[PDB]
Amino acid sequence: GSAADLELERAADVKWEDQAEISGSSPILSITISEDGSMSIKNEEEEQTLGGGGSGGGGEFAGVLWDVPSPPPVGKAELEDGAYRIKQKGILGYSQIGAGVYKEGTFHTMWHVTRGAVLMHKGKRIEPSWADVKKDLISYGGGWKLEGEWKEGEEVQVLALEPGKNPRAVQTKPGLFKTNAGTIGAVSLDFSPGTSGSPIIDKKGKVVGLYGNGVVTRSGAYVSAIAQTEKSIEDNPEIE
Amino acid sequence: LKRX
């Protein structure tokens, strides 16, 4: 709605040992390209996820911070970083539309969550420091960095952030999806889709990427591409 | 439902 007021509502913390549920590996599915960075199945519909966290009791204020054991101790930079849900939260309206991963000192999320619009946390207006529409992702704090590349050969692990629910640690075996251009690499699986912005971890308990470049294919078989840390601190490298 |  507001498309200028998106609150971070924490779903979980980034550490793959939730439920290790076996799945993955599905027939190479056809998918129709749209706006260069997006796809759908010919003419596909869309729905809000909806989320509850982020109370209206001083929901704007200025910045009360989401990382408080005691009342705000003048720290001004405390971050309960992890697997977040991106809800579009107007200061008088709450509607979840995607997800995002904040870890270390960088928040990497997705552009199609609304309009690549500004985030917020206790009314602190978290405005992007990077946004790439072509891959259709966003970075805050600099570029997308964390140092976490999924190694293609093994299973990809996804903290599938179930809508308004607990995460699901799923062992997904990789797959492909063919456009009019050609076949692309992803997790193509017939199963319930998570929120676009769920963390992609590798089976070693390391990696921290992002799931959401695709749609519900066939009639609900979620196909989305496997994104990983490609950028840097900002001007400085990944680490060295 | 997309879900995206």
Closest CA to A79 of A10, A167, A158: A10
Compute the nearest-CA separation of B1 from chain A (Å).
Answer: 5
Chain A, residues 79-98, CB within 8 A of chain B, namely 97-98
Residue of chain B nearest A114, judged by CA positions: B4
Q: What are phi and psi of A61, to 5 degrees?
A: 50, -85
Q: Which of A222, A235, A82, A225 is nearest to A150 (CA)?
A: A225
Tell how strand A38-40 and strand A169-173 pair up.
Answer: unpaired
Nearest-angstrom CA–CA distance, A226 and A209 = 7
Task: Write out the two tokens for A219.
Answer: 């009639």
DSSP A127-191: --SEEETTTTEEEESSSS-S-----BTB-EEEE---TTS---EEEEE-EEEE-SS-EEEEEE-SS
Report how far residue A214's alpha carbon sits from residue A221's, in angstroms, rounded to the nearest whole number: 11
Cβ contact, residue pair B3, A222, below 8 Å: yes
Q: Where are the alpha helices (DSSP H) in A37-78?
A: none
Across the A:B interface, residue pairs with CB atoms under 8 Å apart total: 29
Which amino acid belongs to residue A66?
A: W
How far away is chain A from the Cα of B3, in angstroms, using its nearest Cα? 6
Nearest to A189 by CA among A214, A164, A153, A152: A214
CB contact under 8 A, B2 and A222: no
Give residue limits of the domains in chain A: 1-240
DSSP reduced 3-state for A69? coil
Neighbours of A42 (CB within 10 A): 8
Residue in chain A lying closest to B4 (CA): A196
Question: Solved how?
Answer: NMR
